[PDB]
Amino acid sequence: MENSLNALSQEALYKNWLTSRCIGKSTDSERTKQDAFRSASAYLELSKLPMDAFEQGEKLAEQYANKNSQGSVQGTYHTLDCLSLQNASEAETIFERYSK
């Protein structure tokens, strides 16, 4: 696990941290929330980014947790909102600001 995590780029660790945080902040389930948050903590430990990437990323993760996208078909799409952080330009611009 330590092995697979060490294979990830810094951009991937960050995106995974963002998605994980968003899942935890959106989910109804305390079980799932603490799974999501434990998972976010694992990515965070390996990041070489400074703390402000994560203070700014947390607000983005929360904004995506609350986006409440509606699709054709009634119901929540939080999983989709949270996964969109894998490829969202807002996530990439915070990452770019703090990585070089």
Next chain:
Amino acid sequence: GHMENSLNALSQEALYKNWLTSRCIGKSTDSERTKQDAFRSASAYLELSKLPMDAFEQGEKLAEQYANKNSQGSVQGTYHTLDCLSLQNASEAETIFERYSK
């Protein structure tokens, strides 16, 4: 409409990987609400995929096995969220994708 407008610029591979992760989240969670959310999400990605259905029957297997991976972290508890996100960078996800695109 706007959701698909928003997914239409995503690559076929990124659509497939998000479907995988979404299925994996749904299968691993013990909350029926999180499960239905994840499954509804998965279907949105499915809708824009041009892959044959064999890619999704093979991918479902992969997703359920990642949902049952049960990695242990340095803290006590499940890491299903991390196991499902690992499908975004898994060799297997990419090779299955390639096998059914061309």
